[PDB]
Design a protein around this ligand. Structure first.
Ligand SMILES: *C(=O)[C@H](C[C@@H]1CCNC1=O)NC(=O)[C@H](CC(C)C)NC(=O)OC[C@@H]1C[C@H]1CCC
Ligand SMILES: *C(=O)[C@H](C[C@@H]1CCNC1=O)NC(=O)[C@H](CC(C)C)NC(=O)OC[C@@H]1C[C@H]1CCC
Lengths: 302, 302
């Protein structure tokens, strides 16, 4: 039986209309054009010989407005430039007539967002990721993808949360929030960096087990229960996130009649092993679907 | 190590601009507006009391142009109506000014396409599926999603291949090509229908094993080899598709230095069991990524 779950992204058209190419010196990547502002990673200013230890303050000082070439696939004339953290803010002489309603927000571990992967200012694909507990994402990014953006959507308002910066040695990816901070402890320098341990996102595993029940698959449900406080002690010793329930999870508990604490017990047992059984076609725990995903895709509830 | 593979969809903006709502009688679903034509499922004409055995020919005869209300979220006046297989072709008085370059094609088992899930003519999400060997897709569709479209893209040309019609008893989905045929032996009637067996898509499993090698994961590669002819005999007795190599697979063989026949042998052994080992984080064969996916996402080759 098919779960009815897929990796679902927001329709990308509103964001596609905001993507531009930014070129400075020998570097070319993508930017995001909102109102009279183009956002892009600051390493567009870096020569190749300096990607491992750029002096971004001195590079910024060395640039003029004319150093930055911005093109939509129109040329946008840059009339101001500034640095915010790991991002540049370029002011351009034309306001984007296709600027959506938007905000900037930071995404939290375990939460999902949509990514528009772009090369040379041209959108090429879209996909959805969950921010991992170690502030990486398991994406699909190649050379030239920096400045690709991640976002969520509330109503007609696009909430931009991610601008792509780099790949880590283990193949995962990270980037910046639009306040200019990098996610996690990462730095926008091309050197090897410590990577914190990833963890299973407990609240998302709970969501997936609820998805299993909603699809008629509940062999792992027993009357046994583990409290949130006890689970969270256990989680710390077993590479799980601490569980924090939400109204979205509560709706799944109501719809199925299975209590959260029953599934926290199940997770503890399933972690030791599935004993040859499958859950929604898998023999390992799944933490890449959120409670909101399950509520929306299976229950039709946004 | 992260594979660098994600479920990647085409940017959806070009298709979003083509979606409309179609209402007839008591039914409302989505349509696709290209030039002066709106395509939609013919069961928009059906009353609820007749969804299990509609007489579509008599329903069509009973309709006038004014029976069909088409809205973009503009009202499009219907000036002609016709039935092609399981689809209606409504002629409207306004050509879509945002009509992309497009063709209609039929997708084949194992091939991937992008879906724009729409409700009431409003795009709500996008995802990618592979057409299964039994002509179903493992999608995410709820009431009101009919008329949602699937497509591939070659250059700037959108190749529409799927218009959503129904969910099967096992939770999978199927629909129509734009020649009006349903995929497989399915009928657009709300009754239980035979479902052919699904099968592992051998060419996609081969692609995924190549993806593993490209990521440094090659423990399953041995000098042992199975020929395509011998594998295909085996496949018939073991619920695999017969393997047909392509230039896309050949590029993966060149890049990795591992022959196709080595991976056909591997598949035979892995099917009996992974013996506790993992491949790209999985303990079962993966057939939802194509050779083209691997070439594009990992090798940057379209
Ligand atoms: C920007 O387009 C690019 C995106 C990156 C390249 C390959 N896949 C990707 O997602 N970013 C970088 O190349 C980045 C630049 C620095 C100055 C932030 N460096 C980088 O990603 O290095 C990748 C290799 C694995 C790491 C080894 C030590 C850093
Ligand atoms: C059209 O919006 C709708 C889409 C379907 C509903 C729930 N999830 C979906 O993808 N299509 C139908 O409802 C379809 C109409 C007929 C006339 C083609 N019927 C249908 O999908 O039935 C679903 C239930 C499982 C099957 C049982 C016997 C048919």
């Amino acid at each position: 039986h098919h779960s009815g779950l897929v990796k679902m992204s927001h329709p990308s058209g509103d964001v596609e209309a905001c993507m531009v190419q930014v070129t400075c010196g020998s570097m070319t990547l993508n930017g995001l054009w909102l109102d009279n502002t183009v956002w892009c990673p600051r390493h567009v200013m870096c020569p190749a010989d300096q990607l491992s230890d750029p002096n971004y303050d001195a590079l910024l000082i060395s640039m003029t407005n004319h150093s930055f070439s911005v093109q939509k696939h129109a040329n946008l004339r840059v009339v101001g430039h500034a640095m915010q953290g790991t991002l540049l803010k370029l002011t351009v002489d034309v306001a984007n007539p296709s600027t959506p309603a938007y905000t900037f927000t930071t995404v939290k571990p375990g939460a999902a967002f949509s990514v528009l992967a772009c090369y040379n200012g041209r959108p090429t694909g879209t996909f959805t990721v969950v921010m991992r507990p170690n502030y990486t994402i398991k994406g699909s990014f190649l050379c030239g993808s920096c400045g690709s953006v991640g976002y969520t959507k509330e109503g007609s308002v696009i909430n931009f949360c991610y601008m792509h910066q780099m790949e880590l040695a283990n193949g995962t990816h990270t980037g910046s929030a639009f306040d200019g901070t990098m996610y996690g402890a990462f730095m926008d320098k091309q050197v090897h960096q410590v990577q914190l341990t990833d963890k299973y996102c407990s609240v998302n595993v709970v969501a997936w087990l609820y998805a299993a029940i909603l699809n008629g698959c509940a062999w792992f449900v027993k009357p046994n229960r583990t409290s949130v406080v006890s689970f969270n002690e256990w989680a710390l010793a077993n590479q799980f996130t601490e569980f924090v329930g939400t109204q979205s999870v509560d709706m799944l508990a109501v719809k199925t009649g299975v209590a959260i604490e029953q599934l926290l017990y199940a997770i503890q047992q399933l972690y030791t092993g599935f004993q040859g059984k499958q859950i929604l076609g898998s023999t390992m725990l799944e933490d890449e679907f959120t409670p909101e995903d399950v509520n929306m895709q299976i229950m039709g509830v946004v």
